[PDB]
Ligand binder design. Sequence first.
Ligand SMILES: [Mg+2]
Lengths: 62, 147, 244, 49, 49, 133, 98, 76, 221, 231
Amino acid sequence: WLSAASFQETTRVLTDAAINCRSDKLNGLKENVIIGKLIPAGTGINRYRNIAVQPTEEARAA
Amino acid sequence: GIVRIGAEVRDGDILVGKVTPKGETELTPEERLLRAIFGEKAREVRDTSLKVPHGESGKVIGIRVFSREDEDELPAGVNELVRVYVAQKRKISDGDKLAGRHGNKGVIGKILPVEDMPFLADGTPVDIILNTHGVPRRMNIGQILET
Amino acid sequence: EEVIAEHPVLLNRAPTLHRLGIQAFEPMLVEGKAIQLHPLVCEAFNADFDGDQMAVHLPLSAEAQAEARILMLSSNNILSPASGRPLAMPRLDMVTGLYYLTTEVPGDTGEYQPASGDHPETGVYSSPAEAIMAADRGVLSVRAKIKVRLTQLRPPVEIEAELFGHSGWQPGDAWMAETTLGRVMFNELLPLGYPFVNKQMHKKVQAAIINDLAERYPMIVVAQTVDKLKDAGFYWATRSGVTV
Amino acid sequence: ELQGLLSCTLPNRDGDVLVDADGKAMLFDGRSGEPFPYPVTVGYMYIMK
Amino acid sequence: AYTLQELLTIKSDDTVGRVKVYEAIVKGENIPEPGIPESFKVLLKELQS
Amino acid sequence: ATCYGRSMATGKLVDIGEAVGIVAAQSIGEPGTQLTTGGLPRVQELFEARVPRGKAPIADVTGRVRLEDGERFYKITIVPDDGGEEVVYDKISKRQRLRVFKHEDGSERVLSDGDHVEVGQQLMEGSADPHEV
Amino acid sequence: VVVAEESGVIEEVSADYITVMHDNGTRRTYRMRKFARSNHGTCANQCPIVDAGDRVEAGQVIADGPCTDDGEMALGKNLLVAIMPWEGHNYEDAIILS
Amino acid sequence: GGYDTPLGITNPPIDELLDRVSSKYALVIYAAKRARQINDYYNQLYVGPLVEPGLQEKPLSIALREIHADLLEHTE
Amino acid sequence: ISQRPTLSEDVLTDNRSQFVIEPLEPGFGYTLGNSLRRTLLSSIPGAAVTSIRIDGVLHEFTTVPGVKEDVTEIILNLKSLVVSSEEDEPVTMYLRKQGPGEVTAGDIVPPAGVTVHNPGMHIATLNDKGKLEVELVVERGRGYVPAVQNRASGAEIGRIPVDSIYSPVLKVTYKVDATRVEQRTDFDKLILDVETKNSISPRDALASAGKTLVELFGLAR
Amino acid sequence: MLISQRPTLSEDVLTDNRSQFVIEPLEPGFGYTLGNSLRRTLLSSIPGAAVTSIRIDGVLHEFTTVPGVKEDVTEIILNLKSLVVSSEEDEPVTMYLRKQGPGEVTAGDIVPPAGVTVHNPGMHIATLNDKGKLEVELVVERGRGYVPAVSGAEIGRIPVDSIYSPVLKVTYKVDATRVEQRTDFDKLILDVETKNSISPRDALASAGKTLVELFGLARELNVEAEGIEIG
Ligand SMILES: [Mg+2]
């Protein structure tokens, strides 16, 4: 509903969201943009955003 | 506290000095120490002087001042009102916009030394080099005739 | 200049119609108050110099600098994300230049002759350097047809199949080419090992060559070849005599 | 009339006509020194700041 | 994603993030983690109004 | 990634995190300024799935066609070949032509009454309703 | 631009003002806006274009304001121009200046 | 091996770097986290630079040169 | 084939001369003439006015009572001053004038070693109420240098910095004659035309250019 | 008039016959001033010896096919214009090349008269089949730069293009370097590829000496203050 409120017809969307007591799961790049969270695309998906990086032992010796 | 006529002011220089009464809660830690060690007067003042904005410079060519001490009318609660006039001589530069009278506009991409310009057979260097590819498609051929 | 080194900035020109409307660049200090923009990124920005302005954004975090250097770097985005066609392609002036450089003019100065009579062949040169020497004097025209012995350029498909067969041509193996010195200087810009293109460089042909260099060569080699073509076409565009 | 005027252009102080009847002229490249290969249209244009 | 988050949190309205960014850059430390955009708080307050 | 295919920008297979939806929206919108039913209005008519003006109905089922010629308006009735019942498309505009479709015998010609009609065949020239499709 | 309201002879000319003695004996003096700021920060600076003895007619221009030369709108300069590309510095509407 | 010596920001060719990783985003986060490690090391004196740095080389350039030399592991 | 090049002067006026260099290799004339022209238009030493102080003014954007011109126009007029100095050190000239008349460059009293070559150059016109008193600092330099602001100097307020156009050469062109016979002896004859600003002769300017170019080309050794 | 920060001449040796010199830093404008002059001087002023004309046996009217060999006339002229020769006496010295055995005629099979030297004796010249007889005359002269074929008056002798210049290919480029606070200073970069007669260093030194002597003509007109940069 947060995504739809920012596109068009904010009043109608907000009214119908209040009546239906909607709950936004906050998953979607536009919503993350609004709330300031890493968008779930590109470098923001959990595959790349959580990476373990450590030097090798052959390089730690050299 | 006003700059002197004829002064060359730079980026950030003070034009008119002006102090403002400050409350005893706005003081910085370094400020509270200097106020308490010396026990200065109750007139704690913050610096609100008029400074030169960024990208500005020139000679101060004029000053005008109005005061409530004189019959000069001012809005409610304004004691003094001072205007400083700064003049600058701008030579032509990169990024400056030139245009003929036929809609042929463009910015200066390069100012070449007089020795770099294409020069006529007698040594006269040309002053402005206009690119050919602009003339035919913009449909303004008068600029060529004018030439 | 010490803190600027290898710290990318982001350049943007509104309206940002596609993602190429924001590109990362390495900044170098310039005297003056104007941003200097590479002439090859104007197609992506839809930028001209009739008074246009652009915005500079400074990434701070290590992740933002990495995204600038890798994802949004100028030399990493040469092709249109919409059609795959090259956008960092030689445009009007560079076109005009390279077109003039590779045109063939029948009967130009120092043109090849059939060597009829007691006079032998004249439009033959041992190396492109000798042709450059002949062009220094008024002897040879850049757009004049000649025959040259080339040792550092790959021959065309048919000529390489006929003069070298199964064993591919190698850097150093000479061969005779019937072209203009301008086309030799053009193919000197293309990467070592690209089949010689003996054509008059229309914009379509340039688009085709860059399409192939994208389809087969690394991105960085394309980013270097387009710069070489930029320099060459700008040099030869003023000396082409296009005037109104 | 404009084409006709370019023919009877008065010469410079040395008696040389610098601009032909096509409105072009032979310029030298003040960087390399060699003359530019083809004549270039030169003239006087009103430019505004 | 990270550039977009940085542009929209610690360059506009993360009231603590911008000061922490100044401190980190002045001391050569790593740039801190983004906070919550103040404009989002203002949106919530306007909706509650 | 495999169903999407190559990334136009990179020339290789599209990566994982790519938000190809925004790339597609930008690729469709960027050259929109060049367009001149009409041009861009027709694009908006399609992307919004609106019932197009100048509607050309299509056939619901394979059958025999009967087109009644009228000066002001046309009218069509279809008798199905599957043992069905009559479908009625009516009130056609006299300003609309007839689709030149290749019949079952192979010969392409103007829409001829008393001939075979397949399923979803465009009955007249113009633009068909995508809801009916 | 400053224009004579009535015929006469210049009685005095300074960078500050120009005073003209008419024929009936009356005098008229015109002061000069000197280095005045416009609404848009451009400079309005008038300069007399007559000398001490000159006789001027009614309707004649006495002083030249901004963007005026001898009484005519002079918005630019006569520049020696060559139409040609030049090492891509005038590329895409850019301009090269001596 | 058919390219000229790269300048500045392109010190390792982008293609050779892309070989070490699965895609561009992975390399981005790779180098970013390695650079954060390097800057923490420089603030404490934690693993120091694995290749001799330039005079004043940014940690990101050091990390890119390290990834180019196959001196780091990566687990998606 | 061998014959050393010879330089022959050929004067036309007191401040314009041609210079002929006959035995040069073919294709070698244009580049040599152009190097000489670059050096002449670039790096010929000269002298000009650095700053001025007019009595009764503090900045350029004002008027002096009784003077028809303003200070900006007066400085624009002074731009055309041709002057020569042997001091190689900031020296000062003075100018005073009163009553009606036309202040010209001849009205300037230069110190020893400093000479003003165009005494008739118009500077200002003064009336009954007009009095002009100007100090002019002359320095010796080369090329072109923009006015040195009073921040980079210990200069006080009254000083008015001025652009210094130090170059004394006025216009330089060249022309080559290519003798390309059917035989093996081909050669270009260079003819360099030099005109100076009446401060020095073309001979001296060309000599300075030659010294600068010799000193530069001595690097490749 | 004043003193200038002295430019330095750095050398980078790419190959034994090819080098890159860097003159930096120059005052703004002097990059292109020194560049074209040094290029033309290197290319067309250093004296060197080269082939002027050849007389090939067995063909004097035809000039298209030489019996007994695989190459034709024009390719022979080509790879003979590549012969690196240097002579002492300034007179058109004649040399001879002969070979009978089925094999390859190289530049080491030429009999060089006294006072001349062939610097690339391993260079390939021709290929002799079985029963292949090769006999060719070679005229050598000392000149400068590049001269096209100047003839007749005796059959069999054909003039060729005389590449007298001991340098082969010269290019230059002016980049922008900053001395301090001034990013517009000039930096000249020469790329010179020569023969094996003289190294690029010697060619540059000779061109510099020539240009010094040349502008000495303008120096000799007076003794006036100019730009001084020594030390
Ligand atoms: Mg624009």
